[PDB]
Ligand SMILES: Nc1ccccc1C(=O)CC(=O)O
Ligand SMILES: [Fe+3]
């Protein structure tokens with residue numbers, strides 16, 4: 688399709704997609720000798736992403752910034768493995784995201800989930816300690832002056848997770864929105880909600896993002912770059928699809944169903960797209976946790 692760029696390589700004059708479209712790392716050319724990465728992927732893609740990077744960046748000491756939307760295993764798993772190869776990089780993440788990398792228990796979950804995605808006999812590169820990453824915490828509303836023609840604003844966008852932020856390039860009307868709009872359904876052209884922490888926060892974030900100046904390019908955590916009406920309408924549509932799922936959950940619960948029936952239907956209808964980076968039972972469990980969250984906020988009793 689023409690409204691979705693979903694191939695590795697060059698996406699715009701300044702922008703390349705590294706790695707797998709399903710868990711991409713984005714490469715921004717900031718100047719003649721300066722680059723940034725956006726999104727932090729899964730650990731097992733370290734050598735894939737590195738090889739792709741080296742196709743575009745002759746000297747990786749020119750990679751100066753690495754922007755991170757949130758702490759989930761599939762958005763920061765590359766950091767320990769590529770940061771030793773990027774001597775001048777500064778990781779830019781929210782305060783809460785940074786705190787996750789200081790917690791043994793949080794780091795433990797991230798490593799376990801990423802380890803489950805290793806192909807057999809696959810070994811990972813030498814790693815920076817999670818608590819020694821070259822991180823700089825960024826605040827809600829902070830302007831990131833990455834280069835002469837790259838200025839991106841940090842926007843808090845909690846709900847999917849309690850630490851989640853997005854990055855807005857107003858010059859290009861380009862939003863790196865992470866998972867705050869959900870998972871874009873490639874077969875059907877709609878957003879699938881990913882409400883894994885707080886429903887009211889998730890919806891309130893979408894309300895705020897809808898108020899941004901009209902988007903030309905919308906870049907979530909998975910699936911590539913969206914443009915035209917998909918970008919312009921994305922935040923509003925994601926909001927609408929979340930309400931649709933809430934109503935659906937209430938309809939079925941009013942028929943006496945347990946959360947497990949719609950959980951299984953959601954896993955059936957939606958689990959295929961992420962199967963290669965969501966190990967084992969995590970998708971079905973993610974659907975369950977989402978419906979639990981929605982049920983607590985929206986159930987009448
Ligand atoms: N793409 C997904 C589809 C279903 C469940 C979770 C995800 C994630 O993307 C993981 C996450 O970051 O929360
Ligand atoms: Fe996430």
Ligand SMILES: [Fe+3]
Nearest residue numbers: 759761866908
């Ligand atoms: Fe994700």
